């Protein structure tokens, strides 16, 4: 249980060692304007994504960060968001926990 892969195709995405306690917890539960609930795990680092378009501050769940949609680079599954433009850290990833599969290295 040390590597996280995309659930739909297996693409390598992150590691348990890279989880990031933002404001006290790596886990944050949030809703978007369409009412969807997301269990977001915060990671300092991720790979194998494709970040779409340019950042937006609108509706941001994390104060002072702007977001871009992060898709699985391989299969295009929406995996979460990349956050940037803030402070300590300047950037991180918010990944949707049930879209990942956890497993050995």
Sites of contact with ligand LVY (CB under 6 A): 32-34, 59-61, 67, 81
Return the one option of Zn ion, ligand LVY, none that residue 12 interacts with (CB less than 5 to 8 A, by type). Answer: none
Within 10 angstroms of residue 31's Cβ, the number of other Cβ atoms is 11
Q: Judged by CB under 5 A, does residue 101 bind Zn ion?
A: no
Closest residue to ligand LVY, based on beta-carbon distance: 32
CA–CA dist 93, 28 (Å, integer): 12
**Please, what's the largest Cα pairwise distance for the chain?**
37
Residue 97 dihedral angles phi and psi, to the nearest 5°:
-55, -45
| 42 in a labelled binding site | no
Return the one option of ligand LVY, Zn ion, none that residue 75 interacts with (CB less than 5 to 8 A, by type). Answer: Zn ion
* Shorter beta-carbon distance to ligand LVY: residue 34 or 54: 34
CB 12 within 8 A of CB 48: yes
Known binding-site residue numbers for Zn(2+): 6, 9, 72, 75
């Amino acid at each position: 249980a040390s590597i996280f892969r995309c659930r739909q195709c297996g693409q390598t995405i992150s590691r348990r060692d890279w989880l990031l306690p933002m404001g006290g917890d790596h886990e944050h539960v949030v809703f978007n304007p369409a009412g969807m609930i997301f269990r977001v795990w915060c990671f300092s680092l991720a790979q194998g994504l494709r970040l779409i378009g340019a950042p937006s501050g609108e509706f941001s769940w994390f104060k002072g960060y702007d977001w871009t949609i992060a898709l699985c680079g391989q299969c295009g599954s929406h995996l979460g968001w990349h956050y940037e433009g803030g402070s300590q850290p300047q950037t991180f990833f918010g990944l949707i926990k049930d879209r990942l599969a956890e497993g050995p290295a």
